[PDB]
Amino acid sequence: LPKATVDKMVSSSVVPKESKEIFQNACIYFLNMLTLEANKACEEEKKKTISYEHVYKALKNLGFESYVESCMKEHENYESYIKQKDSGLTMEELHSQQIKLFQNAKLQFERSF
Amino acid sequence: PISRLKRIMQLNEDIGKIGASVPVVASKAIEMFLTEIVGLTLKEASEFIIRATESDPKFAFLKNME
Amino acid sequence: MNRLEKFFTTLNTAQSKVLKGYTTDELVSQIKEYVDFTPYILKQTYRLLCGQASEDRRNGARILRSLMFQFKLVTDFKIEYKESSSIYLSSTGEQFNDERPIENVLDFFEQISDNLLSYEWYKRHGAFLAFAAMFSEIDNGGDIQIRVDSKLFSKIYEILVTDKFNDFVDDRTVAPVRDAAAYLLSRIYPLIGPNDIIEQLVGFLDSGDWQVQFSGLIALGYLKEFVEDKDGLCRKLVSLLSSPDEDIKLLSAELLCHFPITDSLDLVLEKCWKNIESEELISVSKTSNLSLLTKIYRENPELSIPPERLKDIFPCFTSPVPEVRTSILNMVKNLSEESIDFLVAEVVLIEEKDEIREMAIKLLKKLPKNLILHFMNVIGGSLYEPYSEDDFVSYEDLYFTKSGINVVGKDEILKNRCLLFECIMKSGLPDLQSTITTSRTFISLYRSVQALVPANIEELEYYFDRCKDLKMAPLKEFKKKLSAPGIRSIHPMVDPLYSDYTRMVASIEFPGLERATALFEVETCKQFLHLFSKMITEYYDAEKISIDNFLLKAYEGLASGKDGFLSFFEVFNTRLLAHSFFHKIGSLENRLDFFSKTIHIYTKTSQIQKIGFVFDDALREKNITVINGFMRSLEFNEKFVRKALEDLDVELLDAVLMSGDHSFNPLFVKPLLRNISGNIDREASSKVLSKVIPTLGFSTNTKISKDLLEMIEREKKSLESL
Amino acid sequence: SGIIPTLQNVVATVNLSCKLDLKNIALRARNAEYNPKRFAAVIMRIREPKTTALIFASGKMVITGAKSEKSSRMAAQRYAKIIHKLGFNATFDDFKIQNIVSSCDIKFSIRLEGLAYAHSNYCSYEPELFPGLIYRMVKPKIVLLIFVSGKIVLTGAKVRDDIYQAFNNIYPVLIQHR
DNA sequence: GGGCTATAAAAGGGGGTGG
DNA sequence: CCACCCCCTTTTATAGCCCT
């Protein structure tokens, strides 16, 4: 992880330079701890790929009840952002419309230069 | 960052496959839990960080090294 | 101790090879001082040897040989040949489908010996690199003793015959760990007494598997001086050619290239010309066989290339690989024949890399009528139209496709033609009636070179009727572009054809002075400007051309900002000094603006002494761009140091001092410290001294006059006091 | 008419019709990476030319990263020689150019708000989702990406002459939407 | 110098719903 | 019980905005 991303969040009295490198080391350690428990959660359900539902069960087993509520709400907001991201004519009839649009544009192009 | 959490998880050979929905959900959950635990240690006051690890049974898992 | 910590941290956290290189170099130099912490050094060095990064392994081994001044090794070697079915690869194979804590000094040498046969390839390649370094500085030994495994030979022998790990990163494939093992085997051969090793390795060349033969060839590729049975080794080396594995023919021909062949030379050619005639789309063995052929024709000058087998060497000129193109021109360099002469002129016009074509250009300047006429037709052709298939002997997807010429552009196509055109000028040339747009721009120079050993401007519309390029573009926008004349236009053909038109008008008018001024301004191609100026200077030598009105405008060309005229002065250099126009410059104020762009051409000659007033005028207006040109000459550098030492100019020194010689730098150490202590330009005088301190250990140039040379010796001895 | 589009990427398919040992090839080669959980193929790379081929089981290969057409076949034949050098019976059964990615620069700027209006059913343009519209030419089957600056990218053509024919059709359309 | 979003094309294993 | 999608990874040009 980048240290500046954790440093800006921790700053928002001055924090120490030695503690700034220690908090980043603790930040990277927390990610490896949540991923290792989730690896055991994916293996327990016999699933090869690490699922989002398998990662949510790993957070509850560790001892994070308040963090589990934020995970279920952020996932629904992320699902709505991913989901938000009829001519009638057939492949040949829609081809005639586009080829006319190429021909009409060529005629206007000739009129110009 | 999303790709920062993905590159670290896929680095270890034991993990292997990690979903797009799983990496995104953890990226916001890990950062929020760390900023809330560090914020409580600032409210108690380098030595105060070690005191917060002994005060919480939940935060006792951390501070094992350095 | 604090400095050791600063070293290995950088050697593990750094991202650049350059930084790690200097860090490793700093440690291997002062290793004599940090000797007290030898267990800590070896502790951190082990990680460098076992690093997955190929770079860190060679840096790690480098620190070890720098510690070998302290240790003394053992002469007990056990030479045993044992065959085991266990194959060594990149990993255990458990990833898909026991390192000890090194704290004692003896822990290091006990673990690196075990690593020679580890399941991971990078651990083994690291261990063999460590051992090769130990025996590199064995002569410079010490008192502390270390007993190396006597089983080292059986470990190397096993690695060579069992390891099946290769690297196919490039067309030439190599075994990383087996190469480091083969090289170690070479470094420990003098230490071993009477042996069968050298003969045993010849037995590997007859092994069914190519990977065992590969290990055999590479080992002999290191012990090539220890072989006494040269007659026996060569017998197999000839048979090793025409092998199904491409890498076996490559190594064999390269090894046979070192060994002399006089008895069975005809048997070698039979296999060499067969591989070329085989017509294989992708071949790595082809470049090695040609290097072996050159040896036969150079050592034995009696023989010559067969006529029927000469047909096979023709497609080699259009080969995509440059290593093949390099060998061909190095083979037909001595021999001169019309058959190859056409293909050599095809490399100059097509092949991209200038390195390989310069090898071809020099051959042409070292000539039959048939080729002069044949290549004058392809140059005369339009640049927008690519080269023709049946006209050229060698074919390539580039320079022959409509889309292909768009990648290289108009400037590159003209450059290739102009370079070949310079070679034609050397030998006699016959005038032909055949003419094609850009045909008249080359034929007019061709008729001019003919005249060396003019037709006026005709109607502007006449060129639209005969030429093909002007015919497609409209004359309504062409005349408006000509009437501007600089302002660009929306049409895609107005700008490129205006450059083609200016090229044709100025060249037919040659020798011309009024049409040549606008040529150097709008010409996009720089190689054509060198060709046009190559004509002018040849005429001034024979006193055929009279250019003064063009020369006067050429000077004001660089002084204004038109860099086009620079191409003319690079060709016409020292001759400008001897000319009557040089006296006129000694009054013009633009001389500082002119020499700010054309100083590099008059500084290379000894005639820089005549231009000595410009250096004096450069010291006045203090324009570093001109002064930096004279610093290339020691005489003008010595005159500067005498002016700078007398009157110090810190703000000027930092821009001139480092451009000059670093032999005069110790003279400025004492006056700069005087300024910093006295707060005289502290910011600037500290910045300039910061440039001198690293360049203090520079070797004093003996060419310097005893006036300043004795001062340098007196100042360096003073700073040596410590 | 005008300038010619220059291509940068060529995707190809080669059939070897032989059961390949993914673990053996990955364990023998240094330039080949593999991870069964992450992916079902061995990823091998070449220095000259800079190509990356996906070697799957049962002799199915996908060569990617080549700039020119001949280079894509020349790389495929080099990759086949590597597999054959490992002990496997390699066969060059078929070669099919699947994708040709090209980039073309036009000096004049484009107003995507107008082009998306005329080609409402052919284009899907979003301002902040992704800079540029997704132009879809039915025949030739080519999906073009037009940008505001001028630089456009052509992808999806299986034949080289398709991108040249598509550019000559799209160029007069880009003129009227200036 | 990378991340964000997006396009084409092959491939093949692993998943969730349907006939 | 397999079919139909969907996800995953490789390469490449393109581009503002943002961050290290």
Numbering used by the authors:
A (entry chain B): 12 to 23, 29 to 101, 110 to 137
B (entry chain A): 15 to 59, 69 to 89
C (entry chain C): 1 to 97, 143 to 411, 415 to 484, 487 to 503, 510 to 778
D (entry chain D): 19 to 196
What text appears in the publication on this structure?
Mot1 dissociates TATA box-binding protein (TBP) from DNA in an ATP-dependent manner, thereby directly regulating transcription initiation process and global redistribution of TBP in the cell. Mot1 (modifier of transcription 1, also denoted BTAF1) is conserved from protozoa to humans and was the first Swi2/Snf2 member for which the biochemical activity has been demonstrated in vitro. The crystal structure of the N-terminal domain of Encephalitozoon cuniculi Mot1 (Mot1NTD) in complex with TBP showed that Mot1 consists of 16 HEAT repeats (Huntingtin, elongation factor 3, protein phosphatase 2A, lipid kinase TOR) that are arranged in a horseshoe-like shape. NC2 is a heterodimer composed of α and β subunits, which highly resemble histones H2A and H2B, respectively.
In the crystal structure, we find one copy each of Mot1NTD, TBP, NC2α, NC2β, and 24 base pairs of DNA, in a semi-compact complex with approximate dimensions of 100 Å × 95 Å x 95 Å. Mot1 and NC2 occupy opposite binding surfaces on TBP and completely encircle the DNA-bound TBP molecule, which recognizes the minor groove of the TATA sequence. The Mot1NTD is oriented towards the upstream DNA (the 5’ end of the TATA box-containing strand) and predominantly binds the convex (‘top’) side of TBP. Furthermore, like in the human TBP:DNA:NC2 complex, NC2 locks TBP onto the promoter utilizing its histone fold domain (NC2HF), which is bound to the underside of the DNA, and the C-terminal helix H5 of NC2β, which reaches around the DNA and binds the convex side of TBP. Of note is that no interpretable electron density of the Mot1 latch residues 98–142 is observed. Therefore, it is probable that the latch is ordered only after binding to TBP's DNA-binding surface. In comparison with the Mot1NTD:TBP ‘product’ state, the interaction between the Mot1NTD and the convex site of TBP prominently extends towards the C-terminus of Mot1NTD, engaging HEAT repeats 4 to 10 and the insertion domain. As a result, the interaction interface between Mot1NTD and TBP's convex surface increases dramatically from ∼900 Å2 to ∼1500 Å2, as calculated using the PISA server, thus suggesting that Mot1 might even have a tighter grip on TBP in the presence of NC2. Interestingly, the kink of the longitudinal axis of the DNA duplex introduced by TBP appears to be less severe than the ∼90° bend observed in other TBP:DNA complexes and is slightly underwound bringing the upstream DNA closer to the N- and C-termini of Mot1NTD (the ‘gap’ of the horseshoe).
